[PDB]
Amino acid sequence: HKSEVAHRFKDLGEENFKALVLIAFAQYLQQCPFEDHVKLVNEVTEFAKTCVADESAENCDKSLHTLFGDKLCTVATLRETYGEMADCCAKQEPERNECFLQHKDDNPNLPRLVRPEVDVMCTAFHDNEETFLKKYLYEIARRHPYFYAPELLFFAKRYKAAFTECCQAADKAACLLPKLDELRDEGKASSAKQRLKCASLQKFGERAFKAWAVARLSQRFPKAEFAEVSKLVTDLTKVHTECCHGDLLECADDRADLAKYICENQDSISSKLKECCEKPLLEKSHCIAEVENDEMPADLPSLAADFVESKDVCKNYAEAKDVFLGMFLYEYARRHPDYSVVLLLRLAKTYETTLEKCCAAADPHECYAKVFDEFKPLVEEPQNLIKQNCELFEQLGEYKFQNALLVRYTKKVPQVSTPTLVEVSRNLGKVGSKCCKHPEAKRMPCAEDYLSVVLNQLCVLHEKTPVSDRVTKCCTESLVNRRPCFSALEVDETYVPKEFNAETFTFHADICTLSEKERQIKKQTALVELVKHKPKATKEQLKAVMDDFAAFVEKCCKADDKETCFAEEGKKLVAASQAALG
Numbered sequence: 001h002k003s004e005v006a007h008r009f010k011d012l013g014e015e016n017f018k019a020l021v022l023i024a025f026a027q028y029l030q031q032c033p034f035e036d037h038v039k040l041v042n043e044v045t046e047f048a049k050t051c052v053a054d055e056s057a058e059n060c061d062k063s064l065h066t067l068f069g070d071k072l073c074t075v076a077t078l079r080e081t082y083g084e085m086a087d088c089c090a091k092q093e094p095e096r097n098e099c100f101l102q103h104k105d106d107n108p109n110l111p112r113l114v115r116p117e118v119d120v121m122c123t124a125f126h127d128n129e130e131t132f133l134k135k136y137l138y139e140i141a142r143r144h145p146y147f148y149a150p151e152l153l154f155f156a157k158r159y160k161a162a163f164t165e166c167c168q169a170a171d172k173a174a175c176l177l178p179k180l181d182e183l184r185d186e187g188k189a190s191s192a193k194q195r196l197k198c199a200s201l202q203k204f205g206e207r208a209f210k211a212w213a214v215a216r217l218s219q220r221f222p223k224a225e226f227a228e229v230s231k232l233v234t235d236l237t238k239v240h241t242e243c244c245h246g247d248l249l250e251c252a253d254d255r256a257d258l259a260k261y262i263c264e265n266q267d268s269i270s271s272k273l274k275e276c277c278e279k280p281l282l283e284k285s286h287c288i289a290e291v292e293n294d295e296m297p298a299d300l301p302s303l304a305a306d307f308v309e310s311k312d313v314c315k316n317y318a319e320a321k322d323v324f325l326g327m328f329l330y331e332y333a334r335r336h337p338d339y340s341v342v343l344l345l346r347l348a349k350t351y352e353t354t355l356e357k358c359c360a361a362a363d364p365h366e367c368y369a370k371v372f373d374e375f376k377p378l379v380e381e382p383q384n385l386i387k388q389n390c391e392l393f394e395q396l397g398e399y400k401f402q403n404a405l406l407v408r409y410t411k412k413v414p415q416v417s418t419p420t421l422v423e424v425s426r427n428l429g430k431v432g433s434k435c436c437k438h439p440e441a442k443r444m445p446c447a448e449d450y451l452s453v454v455l456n457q458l459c460v461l462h463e464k465t466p467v468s469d470r471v472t473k474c475c476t477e478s479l480v481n482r483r484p485c486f487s488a489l490e491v492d493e494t495y496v497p498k499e500f501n502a503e504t505f506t507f508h509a510d511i512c513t514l515s516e517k518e519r520q521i522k523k524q525t526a527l528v529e530l531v532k533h534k535p536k537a538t539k540e541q542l543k544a545v546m547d548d549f550a551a552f553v554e555k556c557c558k559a560d561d562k563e564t565c566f567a568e569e570g571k572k573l574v575a576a577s578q579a580a581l582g
Ligand SMILES: CCCCCCCCCCCCCCCCCC(=O)O
Pocket: 385, 409, 413, 416, 417, 420, 424, 455, 458, 461, 462, 465, 466, 467, 471, 483, 486, 487, 488
């Protein structure tokens, strides 16, 4: 270990090394050419090979941070392409690195990546598969500077493993795309999740974050002892803090250590880690973070024993509140892998509130005795919402479900952009699709995972373009009662119907050719606009109107000559509805 580069190069391998060096140099230097970055990776790769041969060879001793920042500072243009950033090069050892991290422009101003055509992609991917994948890795990398390099490399393998399995099929497009979409979705969810966690950290402090991590890791490792859990919650919190900070090398080291640790005390944490701990250094932490819940001892007492019945609760509580409450989450969480973390945190905050009222009364034990009773309501609240919503999603398909939501929310916050109201109705509908397929045991957790990112995106958007104070209240409210805040939104009885506009409800024959996913966008955009014009409409007046419009295009799409029955039968419907809705 005389050489850091040689060790990582040897641990990682030439292939993964060249890839990670690329992703790393593309996250900083996100305005440089591909050919330019490729010249670096080759320089740095030949260098690391030198150190592998002779660990005492010039510079091989230097640390990765020094070697890395040293290479950056050699970029000829740097100053004219980046300016301010080039001033970092005047600083020393630790400041220099911190300087670069500061100028790491999150969300750059690069053109959307337009997905080529299945036939061109598949041809590019054969005529030179390496520079094809590397050229795209580079593309995605520069667009997501805070995306964890190793994980960004994990997707770039499923992408490669898709072009492999599809560009050889009869119907390549039928193969490729649906996976290229599952991936796009996945990578987008992953990125949103990471940004989400780094915000909760900053916005709500580590206390809140720790409370989250406890509940989460307790469900995951129900066999582990609270002391172990605490140990992990601590390491875990220090890892996130610095990965959030953006330092890849620092963050990478911290994650490797923690994985190495967890893998060591494997039998002390959980039985479902065998597989993950067999994998290489690169995919170990990632594997573990995704691991499945272990089975709970089954020989677990009652929470009421140590937390509601027994006396000295106030005694054990006052001694170290946070640790006592942390003991409650851990106890409750590992017994309920079927609950959502926020639901668990909601029970802990409630417990915390009672304890803070009873422990100060004449007869404490008599005050908090009925506590577990106050939990019932909080538990059934998300439970009922999930049942009623999945049952409905089963009657009407996804699309007709997405429509149901559309009407519901547009009526709550009519002030919202239609295109955005549609986007959210489609995303929420997917959540019902992905999640309702699960048994009642894994539903609430699923819902939380998905709704969380959606509700956040919703909020970051609203941040930029404020629309309703009510949405702001929920968005700025506590991260634990954020969703319930949205669930409590009410029909906007103050909204003033948007004046009619023929053009808005004017349909053409093109609606006949538009893809299913386009035919829907328009039927849906019209549905929103319709609810925005007559908000007091009923689920029956709307059902009727939607029905007329249904057969409307059927007897106009299948009709000899469209552009006519579309403008003829059209006025009829607009005029007919205008009245049947008055
Ligand atoms: C245009 C600027 C962005 C602002 C967007 C605001 C959109 C508001 C729509 C409200 C949809 C939130 C539903 C979340 C699920 C609530 C759960 C439930 O109904 O039980």
